[PDB]
Design a protein around this ligand. Structure first.
Ligand SMILES: *[C@@H]1O[C@H](CO)[C@@H](O[C@@H]2O[C@H](CO)[C@@H](O[C@@H]3O[C@H](CO[C@H]4O[C@H](CO)[C@@H](O)[C@H](O)[C@@H]4O)[C@@H](O)[C@H](O[C@H]4O[C@H](CO)[C@@H](O)[C@H](O)[C@@H]4O)[C@@H]3O)[C@H](O)[C@H]2NC(C)=O)[C@H](O)[C@H]1NC(C)=O
Ligand SMILES: *[C@@H]1O[C@H](CO)[C@@H](O[C@@H]2O[C@H](CO)[C@@H](O[C@H]3O[C@H](CO[C@H]4O[C@H](CO)[C@@H](O)[C@H](O)[C@@H]4O)[C@@H](O)[C@H](O[C@H]4O[C@H](CO)[C@@H](O)[C@H](O)[C@@H]4O)[C@@H]3O)[C@H](O)[C@H]2NC(C)=O)[C@H](O)[C@H]1NC(C)=O
Ligand SMILES: *[C@@H]1O[C@H](CO)[C@@H](O[C@@H]2O[C@H](CO)[C@@H](O[C@@H]3O[C@H](CO[C@H]4O[C@H](CO)[C@@H](O)[C@H](O)[C@@H]4O)[C@@H](O)[C@H](O)[C@@H]3O)[C@H](O)[C@H]2NC(C)=O)[C@H](O)[C@H]1NC(C)=O
Ligand SMILES: *[C@@H]1O[C@H](CO)[C@@H](O[C@@H]2O[C@H](CO)[C@@H](O[C@@H]3O[C@H](CO[C@H]4O[C@H](CO)[C@@H](O)[C@H](O)[C@@H]4O)[C@@H](O)[C@H](O)[C@@H]3O)[C@H](O)[C@H]2NC(C)=O)[C@H](O)[C@H]1NC(C)=O
Ligand SMILES: *[C@@H]1O[C@H](CO)[C@@H](O[C@@H]2O[C@H](CO)[C@@H](O[C@@H]3O[C@H](CO)[C@@H](O)[C@H](O)[C@@H]3O)[C@H](O)[C@H]2NC(C)=O)[C@H](O)[C@H]1NC(C)=O
Ligand SMILES: *[C@@H]1O[C@H](CO)[C@@H](O[C@@H]2O[C@H](CO)[C@@H](O)[C@H](O)[C@H]2NC(C)=O)[C@H](O)[C@H]1NC(C)=O
Ligand SMILES: *[C@@H]1O[C@H](CO)[C@@H](O)[C@H](O)[C@H]1NC(C)=O
Ligand SMILES: *[C@@H]1O[C@H](CO)[C@@H](O)[C@H](O)[C@H]1NC(C)=O
Ligand SMILES: *[C@@H]1O[C@H](CO)[C@@H](O)[C@H](O)[C@H]1NC(C)=O
Ligand SMILES: *[C@@H]1O[C@H](CO)[C@@H](O)[C@H](O)[C@H]1NC(C)=O
Lengths: 548, 217, 171, 544, 217
């Protein structure tokens, strides 16, 4: 004999909403159903009642916005229209003995939010203490998860403790002051053999999706090792100030507790082939020392590329950076503004534009970044990320959701950049291309089998004669859309006649084509028909039927 | 139109004391006793204590007594325990099928002083790839509520970058739990070494400090 | 009549910049007090030099001065811009043989590199750093619409054009 | 029965000199005495004769400057006066049967020098070959002594070989062109147990003193004159290019035979305090390694002073030096230097490189552009070209033809530009890659027919997994290479693993494939074998 | 006043041939035969071959034949050996007790061809403390004398910093010996790495190169 409420979620103002009270144990032909709401920080407030005959009676403030219906023998629906921000509340349904709401059987309530921010998934991080501050005789230990940055309420955290017992304490949420998002912690106190026990928190956010489940699985320690220090040395230029014809880079990983270690060199963040560099590890006493040597041409050094020494040691990353040295380093702020991708516009159906502002000098104060439309109609709320980079600059990214119909009918969007140290405002604008239209031709090909490439094959796709230039190409294999990073795609270039072309290259492995040898190259483009996509499948088996 | 006035909005009495919560009505209730008294804690549905203005509900203890008639009604809670600290409501049923809740009354229970257990949590490396660092200070199982948390980043007192989350008063020992989250960026975290949480509480003779060093764990 | 002098001579400054308008003529009558005219409105300054500290956009417009003589001075015009590169110039109308100095000036003492001056479309002179063309004389073909391309903090910026026209000194 | 001359000595101009002919075996009361001189490099010249009675007769050029006298029964003196540099000669006395100088008994001659330079003692140095170039078996070996820098003639060298019989030979002296001094090389060839034997040369210089004796004592072999390799490494400025508060300099002495070593740092040639740097030494197998760390202030580094690592190993000095870098755009100018195209290199077999310098000022005074190789071998003339640009700048372009074989073996080529307004010379360098080699894969495809486009097709060529990145692509139709404007090729980008790829695209017309439907996509790449060229043809046909 | 001309100044013939050296005097000699023929090598006094213009001296071989009278005199050396490569002189005795030597004639023998043995010597460490470095290339026991020595310092051909010393022809095997000394400063010697001596000779089909790298001995 219980009651339970469902259907509470985040909707916009003006959106109708239906809650369902599912009852169990009693009959609705004997008992009435009451509806009571309660705002956060406010007391209880009666909404209404349905009787056994179906007659609904409400309060004075309801004014016909609330309707109660009996849908089945166990479910009672409550429908709301004309919702504003005052209706953000936890809603309870109750088994009423009479028309009075004096009863001992209530449901747990469901939570309804009326706001205008983005629905954000939580980021879940473990919370373990410092193991040097954790005593060795500790019969019990307290640990946790932080689920932060989500919008809106609620998340729920359960705990997998293994064979151990665990007291679980979930604190109430705090609204973050800068973003408006929520953050919770969940704490788990266990006893016994906690030092070898593997602990999991399960955080679910039903406003994101019903089956959004994040398991953060972690053990409780943060003692690592004595920390290495990374420094990079370089070749000297000569007595006339001139560079040698090759440049040596020496990445030095100073004295650390011996263990497995990896070194990756990066050229502007991209992984280099390991053959062009060496690495050496020595041990003196109880301490290890590591060096890595990199060889570069003089041309590459003079091209002002940035090189990163990446150290991976016991699951922890260290890093160091270098670029060509300079006596003085002038730099100014620049800004770029993208159009939405066809994939986001027509497949995902959620287009956005991004204003990316790079190479600003990190002075005092935040940079003013404003979105506007030439029509004067309102813009949506944007998201803003600020990130310090390896080369010393600060890069700010702003992403603005745009209306799909808005974009298609030719609206012009503006990014406006202001800062006190700027001379003038930086201005960027973006709009749908005013040229005509032409559909893509698609051709997919496989390279032949030959020695040395038995279990790894290169696949290729040609997309051509389309106009205008904005196109998205992806590869699909066995009812999953493969990640963009798996393949490579050239920049659109003009054809000799009319229109543009792109090439895509995808290296595939033996297990994939033995799984399914059908690989589909698909282009999404505004001029494609009938649903703005065109696709072609290829099989790489391509059997040698000579003379048919 | 009609009103339910619940007085007072807040009342305090120690363990073994008594509180009186009055509900005054502008119009007399249906059949001059249709009023309920409810007890509600945080995150929970309200639990019925009194129905029909004097009759005790099933499962409610006998120390909750209801009285009154007409427009004037009174809940008296004698023999006060530490579990009884909650928000209490009255419900008036009327002619025309109208149910109006009371304004609410918070009951505060004075019990024994417990010192907080302080823990400090460095931010984990999965947050250290997202560009944000949140340092967690936990104050565990303290009575009473009033405690002060100060953040020290390279012995400098922080301001405007910490937020506190406090639980409800517990159902078995009636202590409180607090957390202060210190939110910093990537560059503001890695330019500093020592991170200290200083806790001042009346059960402590001195403000206790738990600290760590960045990378020296 | 008195005439109005500018220090520095440039009638185009940047936002936030200083400048001082001095106004003097022949001393037929002794210098005691002066009148100032921003757009036509009388300014609250009596002394012969008017200081103009931290320019705003409303500091643009027609300027004029006067003394206790009967008739007024000429309508000097002061444009104020906020931008990256302003190709400043000595005089907007010139008469042969007086000096003309040009300066592709950048915001708040910043250094503009790879500077090229353009006269009527063609490239008049280029220098590595910022430079200061000084042509002491002015032919009647020197009249042109000028503009300069520069590089400030590695990025390219073009100045707003400024039309300049020489005239003949007889009549 | 012999004759011997004595008294030949270096004297000043105007100094009288007396030579003595000492005879033995015969009597001067029976035989006459002739005097004959011979200049160095010239013929013999008769001076005079004294008879048995004491009468002397001289040549026509003597003019009374010479006098002969009989001093004893065995000695005959020749007094010679008013001397200039033409009397520098070797002087012979002879036993004359009659007044004719037709005789078979002559003395060895004595040497008379008239000079005006300073008397210098010789410096004696051993001359031993390299012991790795000396073979292990090596039944005879040749060694020597160089006695150099002496004035005037002569020196004499004898040899101590120990227990060996040996052969000695002394070469004639050479006048030094810069100083005017002399130098001799005296060589000794020995055999047997020469590897343990200590050999000595005695160089004596009677112009310095009569007992100036230099015995110089040495062996054939020892160990290597071990040349420990000096290199200087330096601190980083960071990822924004900013300098740190201090600069570390690291001098490395890597892989050398162990011994005493000292490291001194100089700042503009003056010795820096010992506490400003720390040195350490390790050993691995046989080879030693030494390092030294020097700490500099940022200000000192930025002052453009020269820092010298001075390594003293076994008493000998090995050097390296450094100063602050030049950051390749001194006045905002840019310079670029290309590599040869593979098509130019391997197909036409006339590779060229091009040096382009942009954003110079159009002022007077021609730019000085010079090409060079690090090895110092000669370069050809280039096509020097200048042109002013539409934006008022001046670009100078030069194209140099280079040897195909020269490039393939890894030569470095240098373009050097000097302008009068530039504060220092600007250099650019280019060379072959130091990474691995991987030949390209070539794949060629014809598109199927698309509805509505009956008279056109597109050909696609995939070139992949090559290393290094330099590559040329051509398309051919009817055995002739099609113009470059007909086809489009992307810039090289990295694959997912090793190597690079490009795609090439060629639109064709119906007339072309009906003329010949076979079209060849050919890639030229340095790693391709056997002639740096790999191709694949494609047709627009079906199997049928 | 009086002249005595020896023709030619140089004459060449192989082994087994003959040479003729003529001496012509402006005035006839004393008693029309007083003339001698001498043979002189390097560093040695001249040895008498002919006295009284036809009479062979004691110890001279019979293959030297003197002839002539008056003013015109001729030495014939038939059956030529490699020992006979020397400088030959004629001596005229005249009235008034006058002895006049001839101008001299260099006789060049062709004998069998020997290739040079090439050795290279780095400068010793005692010379390297003095600021000067001398690199020695030795060409040992060769015939003929005509050979070319080229110095290569980091594959660059040297010019003006090398000097050669050539010995006289040997009295046993009739070969020559040569040395080329390359003289450099200490700053120039330490700026270069490889040092090569290239020898071209008529007995060698290719120019043989002996080289050393700095140190590595
Ligand atoms: C017009 O031309 C002048 C050039 O002469 C430009 O700048 C002038 O700069 C001086 C120097 O600052 C100003 O004089 C005074 O500045 C004080 C602050 O700086 C001093 O003090 C600190 C320590 O306190 C030192 O470290 C520093 O080195 C200086 O010694 C102010 O405190 C003074 O008092 C008043 O001024 C401020 C201005 O914001 C008021 O808000 C305060 O309430 C206070 O009462 C004083 O100003 C001088 O004033 C500047 N001139 C002008 C006209 O402002 C101008 O910038 C230029 N105008 C342009 C370019 O538009
Ligand atoms: C004396 O007379 C003067 C002339 O009659 C009067 O001067 C005029 O003042 C107004 C306002 O002060 C000037 O308008 C300027 O400001 C607005 C708003 O500024 C914003 O936009 C700018 C775009 O350039 C940004 O740079 C700013 O940071 C800010 O975001 C603009 O709408 C104007 O821009 C327009 O005009 C300029 C040229 O002035 C162009 O370059 C622009 O592209 C755009 O077309 C101005 O920036 C107005 O320009 C000015 N008149 C003149 C001729 O300069 C003055 O008010 C008066 N004084 C008194 C006390 O009466
Ligand atoms: C115009 O430029 C002037 C530069 O000289 C500015 O300065 C002076 O400012 C003072 C006070 O504001 C004025 O003084 C007033 O007038 C007289 C004269 O006093 C002055 O002279 C005596 C010596 O004779 C000296 O001791 C004083 O300190 C003053 O400098 C007196 O009755 C009073 O002091 C009175 O304050 C000056 O008149 C004035 N000088 C001139 C030449 O006008 C002046 O501020 C500028 N005007 C502006 C900005 O409107
Ligand atoms: C370049 O710079 C000069 C100053 O630095 C400029 O000034 C002077 O300009 C005159 C113009 O003719 C030159 O010629 C002299 O003219 C005077 C007077 O001119 C008379 O004739 C004209 C023509 O009809 C008439 O209009 C006038 O009213 C006068 O009646 C004569 O007296 C002289 O003989 C001489 O010809 C000057 O030479 C020149 N001065 C100098 C120092 O060069 C000059 O104009 C500038 N040029 C340009 C193209 O801008
Ligand atoms: C060249 O362009 C400049 C603007 O950049 C014009 O302004 C003049 O610039 C010079 C040098 O920058 C100023 O000279 C001053 O000298 C003193 C003493 O050395 C020093 O204290 C100052 O800081 C400054 O260097 C000059 O006052 C300034 N004149 C004006 C009216 O602003 C200049 O007119 C142009 N032409 C020439 C021929 O220089
Ligand atoms: C100010 O300008 C006026 C312009 O009209 C000058 O007027 C003068 O008036 C007299 C009387 O008719 C004439 O004779 C003159 O020819 C006019 N012009 C000039 C230039 O004097 C007036 O004089 C001017 N004031 C001053 C001080 O010059
Ligand atoms: C379970 O919790 C109790 C405390 O309530 C503790 O004493 C006990 O050791 C725990 N048991 C295990 C197996 O951890
Ligand atoms: C988390 O763990 C639970 C417990 O087994 C499991 O049902 C759930 O699927 C897990 N979720 C993820 C995302 O792994
Ligand atoms: C120098 O060497 C010679 C060669 O054997 C030797 O006779 C002589 O005694 C040596 N000189 C001295 C001073 O020993
Ligand atoms: C010494 O004489 C013998 C006799 O033939 C010879 O074999 C040997 O090589 C000679 N030694 C040297 C060093 O020439």
């Amino acid at each position: 004999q219980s009651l339970e409420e469902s259907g509470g979620r985040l909707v916009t103002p003006g959106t109708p909403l239906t809650l369902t009270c599912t009852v169990s144990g009693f009959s609705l032909s004997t008992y009435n159903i009451h509806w009571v709401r309660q705002a956060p920080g406010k007391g209880l407030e009666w909404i209404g009642v349905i009787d056994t005959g179906g007659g609904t009676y409400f309060a004075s403030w309801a004014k016909g916005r609330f309707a109660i219906s009996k849908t089945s023998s166990t479910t009672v629906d409550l429908k709301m229209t004309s919702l504003t921000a005052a209706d953000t509340a936890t809603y309870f349904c109750a088994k009423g003995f009479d028309y009075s709401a004096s009863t001992n059987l209530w449901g747990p309530g469901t939570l309804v939010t009326i706001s205008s921010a983005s629905t954000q998934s939580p980021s879940v991080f473990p919370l373990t203490r410092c193991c040097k501050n954790i005593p060795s005789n500790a019969t019990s230990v307290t640990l946790g998860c932080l689920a932060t940055g989500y919008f809106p309420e609620p998340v729920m955290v359960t705990w997998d403790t293994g064979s151990l017992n665990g007291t679980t304490m979930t604190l109430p949420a705090t609204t973050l002051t800068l973003s408006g998002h929520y953050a919770t912690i969940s704490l788990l106190t266990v006893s016994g053999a906690w030092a070898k026990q593997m602990f999991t928190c399960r955080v679910a956010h039903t406003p994101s999706s019903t089956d959004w489940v994040d398991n953060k699985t972690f053990s409780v320690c943060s003692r690592d090792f004595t920390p290495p220090t990374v420094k990079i040395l370089q070749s000297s230029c000569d007595g006339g100030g001139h560079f040698p014809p090759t440049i040596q880079l020496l990445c030095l990983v100073s004295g650390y507790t011996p263990g497995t270690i990896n070194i990756t060199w990066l050229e502007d963040g991209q992984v280099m082939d390991v053959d062009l560099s060496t690495a050496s590890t020595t041990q003196e006493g109880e301490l290890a020392s590591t060096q890595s040597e990199l060889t570069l041409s003089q041309k590459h050094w003079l091209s002002d590329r940035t090189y990163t020494c990446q150290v991976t040691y016991q699951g922890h990353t260290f890093e160091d950076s270098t670029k060509k040295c300079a006596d003085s380093n002038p730099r100014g702020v620049s800004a770029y503004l993208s159009r939405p991708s066809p994939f986001d516009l027509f497949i995902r159906k959620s287009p956005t534009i991004t204003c990316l502002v790079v190479d600003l000098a990190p002075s005092k104060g935040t940079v003013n970044l404003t979105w506007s439309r030439a029509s004067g109609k309102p813009v949506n709320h944007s998201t803003r990320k600020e990130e310090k980079q390896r080369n010393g600059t600060l890069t700010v990214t702003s992403t603005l959701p745009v209306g799909t119909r808005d974009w298609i009918e030719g609206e012009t969007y503006q990014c406006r950049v202001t800062h006190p140290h700027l001379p003038r405002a930086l201005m960027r604008s973006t709009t749908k291309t005013s040229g005509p239209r032409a559909a893509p031709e698609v051709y997919a090909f496989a390279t032949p089998e030959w020695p040395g490439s038995r279990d790894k094959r290169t696949l290729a796709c040609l997309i051509q004669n389309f106009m205008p230039e904005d196109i998205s190409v992806q590869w699909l294999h066995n009812e999953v859309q493969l990640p963009d990073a798996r393949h490579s795609t050239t920049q659109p270039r003009k054809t000799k006649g009319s229109g543009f072309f792109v090439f895509s290259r995808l290296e595939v492995t033996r297990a994939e084509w033995e799984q399914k040898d059908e690989f589909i190259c698909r282009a999404v483009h505004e001029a494609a028909s009938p649903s703005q996509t065109v696709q072609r499948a290829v099989s790489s088996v391509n059997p040698g039927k000579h003379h048919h | 139109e009609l009103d339910m006035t619940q007085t007072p909005s807040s009342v305090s009495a120690p363990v073994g004391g008594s509180v009186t919560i009055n509900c005054q009505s502008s119009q007399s209730v249906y059949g001059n006793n249709y009023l309920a008294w409810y007890q509600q804690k945080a995150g929970q549905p309200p639990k019925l204590l009194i129905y029909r203005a004097s009759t005790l509900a099933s499962g409610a203890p006998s120390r909750f007594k209801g009285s009154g008639s007409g427009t004037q009604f009174t809940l008296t809670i004698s023999d006060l325990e530490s579990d009884d600290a909650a928000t209490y409501y009255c419900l008036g049923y009327y002619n025309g099928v109208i149910n109006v809740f009371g304004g609410g009354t918070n009951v505060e229970i004075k019990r024994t002083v417990g010192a907080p257990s302080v823990f400090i949590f460095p931010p984990s490396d999965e947050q250290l790839k997202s560009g944000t660092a949140s340092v967690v200070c936990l104050l565990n199982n303290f009575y009473p509520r009033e405690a002060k948390v100060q953040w020290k980043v390279d012995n400098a007192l922080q301001s405007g970058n910490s937020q506190e989350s406090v639980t409800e008063q517990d159902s078995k020992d009636s202590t409180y739990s607090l957390s202060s989250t210190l939110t910093l960026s990537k560059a503001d975290y890695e330019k500093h070494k020592v991170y200290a949480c200083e806790v001042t509480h009346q059960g402590l003779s001195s403000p206790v400090t738990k600290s760590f060093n960045r990378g020296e764990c | 009549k008195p005439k109005v002098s500018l220090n520095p001579p440039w009638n185009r400054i940047f936002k936030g910049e200083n400048v001082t308008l001095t106004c003097n003529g022949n001393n037929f009558f002794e210098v005691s007090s002066t009148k100032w005219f921003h757009n036509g409105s009388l300014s609250e300054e009596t002394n012969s030099s008017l200081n103009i500290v931290n320019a705003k956009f409303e500091d643009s417009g027609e300027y004029k001065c006067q003394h206790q003589q009967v008739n007024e001075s000429e309508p000097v015009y002061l444009e104020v811009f906020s931008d990256w590169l302003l190709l400043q110039a000595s005089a907007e109308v010139v008469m042969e043989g007086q000096p003309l100095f040009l300066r592709c000036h950048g915001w708040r003492n910043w250094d503009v590199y790879k500077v090229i001056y353009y006269k009527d479309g063609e490239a008049l002179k280029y220098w590595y750093e910022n430079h200061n063309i000084s042509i002491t004389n002015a032919t009647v073909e020197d009249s042109g619409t000028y503009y300069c391309t520069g590089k400030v903090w590695q990025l390219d910026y073009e100045s707003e054009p400024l039309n300049i026209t020489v005239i003949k000194a007889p009549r």
